[PDB]
Amino acid sequence: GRLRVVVLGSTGSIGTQALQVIADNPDRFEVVGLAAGGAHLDTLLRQRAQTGVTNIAVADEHAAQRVGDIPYHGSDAATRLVEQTEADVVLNALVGALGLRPTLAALKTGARLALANKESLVAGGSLVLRAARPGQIVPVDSEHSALAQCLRGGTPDEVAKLVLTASGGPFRGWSAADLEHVTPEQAMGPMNTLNSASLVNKGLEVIETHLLFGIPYDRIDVVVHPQSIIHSMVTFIDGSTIAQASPPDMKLPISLALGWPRRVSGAAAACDFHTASSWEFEPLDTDVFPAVELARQAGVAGGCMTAVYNAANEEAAAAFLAGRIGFPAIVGIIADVLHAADQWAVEPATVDDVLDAQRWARERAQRAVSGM
Amino acid sequence: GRLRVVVLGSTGSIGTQALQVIADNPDRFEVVGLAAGGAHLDTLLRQRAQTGVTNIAVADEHAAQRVGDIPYHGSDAATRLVEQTEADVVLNALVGALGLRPTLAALKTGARLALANKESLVAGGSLVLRAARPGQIVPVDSEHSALAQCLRGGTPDEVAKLVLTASGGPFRGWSAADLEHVTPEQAGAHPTWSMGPMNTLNSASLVNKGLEVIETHLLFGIPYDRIDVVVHPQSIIHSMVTFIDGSTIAQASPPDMKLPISLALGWPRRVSGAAAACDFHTASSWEFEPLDTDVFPAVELARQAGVAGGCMTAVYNAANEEAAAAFLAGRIGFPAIVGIIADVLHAADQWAVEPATVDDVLDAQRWARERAQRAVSGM
Ligand SMILES: [Mn+2]
Ligand SMILES: [Mn+2]
Numbered sequence: 001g002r003l004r005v006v007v008l009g010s011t012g013s014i015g016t017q018a019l020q021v022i023a024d025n026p027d028r029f030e031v032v033g034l035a036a037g038g039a040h041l042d043t044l045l046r047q048r049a050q051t052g053v054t055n056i057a058v059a060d061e062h063a064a065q066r067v068g069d070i071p072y073h074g075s076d077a078a079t080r081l082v083e084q085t086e087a088d089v090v091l092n093a094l095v096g097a098l099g100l101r102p103t104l105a106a107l108k109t110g111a112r113l114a115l116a117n118k119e120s121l122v123a124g125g126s127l128v129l130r131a132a133r134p135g136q137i138v139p140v141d142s143e144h145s146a147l148a149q150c151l152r153g154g155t156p157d158e159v160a161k162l163v164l165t166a167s168g169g170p171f172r173g174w175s176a177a178d179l180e181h182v183t184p185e186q187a188m189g190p191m192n193t194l195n196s197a198s199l200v201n202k203g204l205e206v207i208e209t210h211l212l213f214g215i216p217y218d219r220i221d222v223v224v225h226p227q228s229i230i231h232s233m234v235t236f237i238d239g240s241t242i243a244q245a246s247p248p249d250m251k252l253p254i255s256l257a258l259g260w261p262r263r264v265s266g267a268a269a270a271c272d273f274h275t276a277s278s279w280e281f282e283p284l285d286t287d288v289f290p291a292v293e294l295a296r297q298a299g300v301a302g303g304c305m306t307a308v309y310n311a312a313n314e315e316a317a318a319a320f321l322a323g324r325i326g327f328p329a330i331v332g333i334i335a336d337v338l339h340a341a342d343q344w345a346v347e348p349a350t351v352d353d354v355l356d357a358q359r360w361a362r363e364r365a366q367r368a369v370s371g372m
Numbered sequence: 373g374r375l376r377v378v379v380l381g382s383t384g385s386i387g388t389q390a391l392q393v394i395a396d397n398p399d400r401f402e403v404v405g406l407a408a409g410g411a412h413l414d415t416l417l418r419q420r421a422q423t424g425v426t427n428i429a430v431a432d433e434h435a436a437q438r439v440g441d442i443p444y445h446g447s448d449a450a451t452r453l454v455e456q457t458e459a460d461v462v463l464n465a466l467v468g469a470l471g472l473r474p475t476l477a478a479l480k481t482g483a484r485l486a487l488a489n490k491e492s493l494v495a496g497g498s499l500v501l502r503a504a505r506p507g508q509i510v511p512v513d514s515e516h517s518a519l520a521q522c523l524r525g526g527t528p529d530e531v532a533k534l535v536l537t538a539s540g541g542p543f544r545g546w547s548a549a550d551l552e553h554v555t556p557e558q559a560g561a562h563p564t565w566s567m568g569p570m571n572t573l574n575s576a577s578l579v580n581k582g583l584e585v586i587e588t589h590l591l592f593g594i595p596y597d598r599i600d601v602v603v604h605p606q607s608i609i610h611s612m613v614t615f616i617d618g619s620t621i622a623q624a625s626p627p628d629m630k631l632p633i634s635l636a637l638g639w640p641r642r643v644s645g646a647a648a649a650c651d652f653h654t655a656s657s658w659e660f661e662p663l664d665t666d667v668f669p670a671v672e673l674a675r676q677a678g679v680a681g682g683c684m685t686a687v688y689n690a691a692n693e694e695a696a697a698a699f700l701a702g703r704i705g706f707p708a709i710v711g712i713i714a715d716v717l718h719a720a721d722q723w724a725v726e727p728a729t730v731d732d733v734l735d736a737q738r739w740a741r742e743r744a745q746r747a748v749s750g751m
Contacts, residue, residue: 149621152524158642160649223652233624239631239647241624242521245612252618263530268618273535273602274662282655 006033038063145253146231146244153242182327203295304357315365381465410435517632518610525621554706582674694744
C-alpha cells in the first residue's frame with residue numbers, strides 16, 4: 001500500500017530531491033504524476049524514463065510540442081493533471097503565485113498537500129484554508145516542518161509563542177547605506193536566493209506560519225540564526241522551548257511531508273555531536289530589514305492583502321534582477337503598494353478575487369518602478 | 373483537576389521548590405503528606421504549620437523525640453506514610469538509600485511517581501523497573517525531563533539516539549596533567565546551605581553524567597550504545613532526541629529546576645508560568661563540544677556497569693561515593709576517583725546477578741564500599 005505521489009515542479013531542486021526520497025523508499029512511495037515548466041526538458045525526459053511515469057504536465061506549449069506524447073500542456077496543465085490523477089499526496093513545488101490553482105485543485109481532491117510553494121498559501125489565504133480539512137496541508141518549508149514537529153511537545157492550549165529562525169541572508173549586519181550598493185550577483189533559484197537576502201522570504205514565512213497553525217501574528221517571533229541548524233522552535237506556557245535541529249538538507253522536511261505522520265528512515269544526516277559546533281542567535285534588525293514587519297501588517301489586514309504583499313514583491317524583485325531598481329527599492333515598493341491597497345482587505349470568495357488583487361498589485365508595483 | 377501530592381524529602385532543594393510550585397498553583401495541586409529525614413526537623417514543623425498538613429513522617433526516631441504528634445516516625449516512616457496515604461502523585465526527593473523502599477511502596481499504590489531520588493534507579497535497577505508500569509515513573513531531573521519532552525517528537529520505533537547534555541563541570545577542557553592538581557575546593561567542596569559536596573563533585577568528575585546515562589537507559593529503554601553525551605557549557609539545551617530520519621528535537625530553557633519539577637508533578641500537563649522562557653532579544657550562543665573520554669572516562673565506565681546489569685550499577689555508585697569521600701578527605705587525588713571505580717567494577721562480576729530484594733542491592737553496595745576502601749588504603 002504505497003502512497004501515490006504527484007510531483008509538481010519536478011525538475012527543480014525540491015522536485016528532484018523528492019524523487020530521490022521516493023526512489024530510496026519504494027515500499028512507502030510511488031510517483032504517479034509529474035509537472036514541469038518546460039525549461040529543463042533533459043531532466044524531465046530522464047524522470048519519465050526512470051519513474052516510468054508518462055502522466056506529465058508541461059506548462060510551455062512549445063516545450064510540450066518539442067517533447068511529445070505530453071497529455072497535459074499549456075498554462076492550466078498542472079491544475080488539470082491534479083484534477084484528473086488519483087493520488088494520496090500532491091507535492092506542490094511550483095514557483096511563485098502561479099502555484100495557486102494547482103494548490104486549490106489538490107486540496108479539492110482530498111489528497112495531502114505537501115506544500116513547498118508557500119506563495120499559493122500566502123496569496124490564497126482564507127480561500128485556500130476553506131478548501132482544506134484540518135492537517136491536509138503539510139509544510140515542506142524547513143521552518144514550518146520544524147514548527148509542526150515541535151508542536152508535538154504540548155497541546156494547542158499550551159502554546160505561548162512560535163519562534164521562526166532566519167538565516168539573516170548574505171547581508172546580515174549590513175547598514176541601510178551598505179544595502180544601496182547591493183548587486184543582483186551578490187543577491188536554489190534566483191527568487192529563493194533573493195527573497196532570502198531581502199528578508200521577504202521570512203515575511204512570507206511569517207504569513208505561512210499564521211495560516212498553517214492559526215497562531216496570532218503577535219505570537220510569531222523571528223530570530224536570526226546564521227548557522228541554520230535550528231530550523232524553528234515552539235515556546236510553551238511553562239517556559240519550556242522545543243526546537244528542531246538538523247544539518248541543512250531539504251530531504252528531511254520533504255520526506256516528513258510526503259509520509260506524515262511517519263518519519264522516513266535515513267532521509268537525512270543527523271547533527272553530529274562528536275564534533276564542536278556553535279548555534280548563535282541574534283535579534284533581527286527591523287529598521288534595516290522591515291520586510292517581516294510589512295508582512296505582519298499585510299497579514300493582520302488579511303483578506304487579499306497577503307496576495308498583494310507577495311505580488312508586489314514578485315514585480316519589484318524582477319525589476320531588481322533586471323538591473324532596473326536598487327536593492328532597498330524592493331521593500332520600498334512593497335510598502336508603497338500596501339499603503340495604497342485599501343480595498344484588498346476583503347476576504348476572497350473565489351480564485352478570481354485573489355487574481356484581481358494580484359493584477360492590481362502588479363500594476364501598482366510597476367507604477368512604483370516607473371516613478372524611480 | 374486537583375492532584376493530591378505526597379512530598380518525600382520535603383526539606384531538601386527539590387522538595388522545597390516543589391512546595392513553591394504547589395503553593396503557586398493551588399487549583400492544580402494539593403499537598404497531602406510530607407516526609408523528611410529529621411536533620412531539618414524545624415523546617416518540617418514550619419511546613420506543617422504553613423500547609424496545615426499534619427500527615428507527616430520523620431525517619432530519625434531520635435529526632436522525632438522532639439515532637440509529640442508525628443503520626444509516622446522511625447526507620448520506615450516514609451514508606452508507611454506512602455502506604456497509608458491516598459494520593460495521585462508521590463514526589464520522591466529523598467536522598468540516597470532511604471529513597472528505595474518508598475519508591476517501591478509508591479509504585480505499589482498505583483500513584484504516579486515523580487522521581488528525583490537517583491538511588492532508586494541506579495541501585496534499585498530491575499527491582500524498581502519490574503515494579504513500575506509504563507508511564508508510572510516521571511523523571512524530575514532536567515536532562516531526563518528534557519528527554520521525556522523530546523520523545524513526543526515521534527513514536528518509540530522512530531528513536532535513533534538519546535543525547536544528554538553535560539555542563540562539562542569546572543574542569544571542562546582540562547588535560548589529564550591539569551586534573552592531577554585538582555583540590556576539593558576547586559572541585560566545588562564549599563559547604564553550601566542546601567546541598568552536600570557530592571553534587572558538585574560528581575558534576576566535576578562526570579560521574580553525575582554517568583549516573584544520568586544509567587537512569588536514561590532504565591527510564592527510556594534505549595541501549596547504551598545509542599545514549600550519547602555532549603558537552604554544552606551554557607546548560608540551556610537540557611537534552612535532545614535524534615530520530616531515524618535525521619531530525620533532532622531539543623528542549624531548551626534558562627536553568628531553573630522549577631520547570632522539570634512542575635512538569636513531573638503535573639505530567640502530562642504543563643504548568644503555566646513555571647519558569648522563564650528563552651529570550652532572544654539579546655544575542656547569545658549555544659555551544660557544543662565532544663567529551664574527551666580518555667580524560668573523562670566516568671561515562672564510559674557507567675555504560676560498562678549498565679551493560680553488565682544486575683547490581684553492577686549499584687556497585688558503580690557505591691564505589692564512587694567511597695572514592696569521592698577519600699578525595700574530599702585528601703586521601704587520594706582527583707584522577708583516582710574514577711580509577712578506583714574502575715578497579716572495583718572490574719572485580720565485581722559476582723554482582724551481575726539481578727537483585728531479588730532490597731537487601732541484595734544493599735549487599736552489593738556494602739561489598740563495593742569495602743572494595744573501594746581497600747583500593748584507597750592499599751590493603
Ligand atoms: Mn524556509
Ligand atoms: Mn542533571
